[PDB]
Design a protein around this ligand. Structure first.
Ligand SMILES: [Ca+2]
Ligand SMILES: [Ca+2]
Ligand SMILES: [Ca+2]
Ligand SMILES: [Cl-]
Ligand code: NA
Length: 290
DNA sequence: GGGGGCATGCAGATCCCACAGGCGCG
DNA sequence: CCGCGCCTGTGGGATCTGCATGCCCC
């Protein structure tokens, strides 16, 4: 199994990973973990992450889903080494930090003492979705949840390839002209993301030299889109970036099909019946995969 | 002998993905 | 007239995240 470039691995973790701190009434169960859950079609990504890290278990989740779970205490140390040298970039970095704090508590066995469990609860309260009702009623003293916002730049193209392989999308639009009858083609690249990382997403315009940020009304949704629709930007900026910075998983196959369409458009063949037919065949290939 | 962490799951919540159509512009 | 692509708008499921517990080892 091929191994993933370390920065590409961190990008994919920014997109799809999850740091978990479970605190359950057994006396208390305490379980730190890092988890990536994907559809079966991208199990190879998890296997390649597994062999790159040499830690974690791959488990099936129902018939359609699969997840890589790192939970062994010693394995947690491998994850922390990786993320110190190749740190997260999104607000998830703040969950990694707290995760690393909880690992330090448990490493010192401080979670066995009374004040230990309370210390983990103070950390978990700031992780992900906070404390459940149970832990709130048992620890009414733990009130603080606000943590510092992350503000980091895109570090490099390999990180972007990993992030894009998780939260990105390469797709081909066909629009039948309601004014005429000719079918148009439009290549689109889009990354969507929760507005908590609006600054990072906005920096994509500067990093890539193209694109637009689209938002709804503040009441409508909590996520926004980065999108490129102008073909000369697709062809001259987006494609070379991901030829250099290799995608992983099914997103790599989408990108390869995507570039076949780009080449036809560059050759003006999208305005002929034979070129349009080939683009429809490529799009059929993409719809099948995903 | 038993406390604690492992092994191996199952389930709930939402943030993505992969698009759609109106229409102004050059 | 035309093709392009800016811009508004979105269904639904693949993600993110949380919740469980019997077994085993030192
Ligand atoms: Ca994500
Ligand atoms: Ca994904
Ligand atoms: Ca994702
Ligand atoms: Cl680059
Ligand atoms: Na680049």
């Amino acid at each position: 199994r091929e191994s993933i470039n370390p920065w590409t691995l961190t990008g994919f973790a920014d997109a799809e990973g999850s740091f978990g701190l479970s605190i359950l009434n057994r006396r208390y169960h305490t379980r730190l973990s890092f988890t990536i859950m994907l559809h079966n079609k991208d199990k190879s990504i998890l296997e390649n992450i597994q062999s790159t890290w040499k830690v974690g278990s791959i488990l099936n989740n129902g018939d359609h889903y699969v997840s890589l779970v790192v939970y062994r205490f010693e394995d947690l140390k491998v994850i922390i080494d990786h993320f110190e040298k190749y740190p997260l970039i999104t607000q998830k970095l703040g969950d990694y930090k707290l995760f690393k704090q909880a690992f330090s508590v448990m490493e010192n066995k401080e979670h066995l003492k009374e004040n230990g469990i309370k210390e983990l609860v103070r950390i978990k309260a700031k992780m992900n979705w906070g404390l459940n009702d149970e832990l709130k009623k048992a620890f009414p003293e733990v009130i603080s949840r606000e943590r510092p916002l992350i503000n980091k730049n895109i570090p490099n193209g390999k990180w972007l390839a990993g992030f894009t392989s998780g939260d990105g999308s390469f797709f081909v639009r066909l629009r039948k002209s309601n004014v005429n009858a000719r079918v148009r083609v439009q290549l689109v690249f889009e990354i969507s993301q929760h507005i908590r990382d609006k600054n990072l997403m906005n920096s994509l315009i500067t990093y890539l030299g193209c694109g637009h940020i689209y938002e709804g009304n503040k009441s409508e949704r909590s996520w926004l889109q980065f999108r490129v629709e102008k073909f000369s930007d697709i062809n001259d900026k987006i494609i070379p970036v991901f030829q250099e910075n290799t995608l992983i998983g099914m997103k790599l196959e989408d990108f390869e099909d995507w570039c076949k369409v780009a080449k036809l458009i560059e050759e003006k063949k999208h305005l002929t019946e034979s070129g349009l037919d080939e683009i429809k065949k490529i799009k059929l290939n993409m719809n099948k995969r995903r």
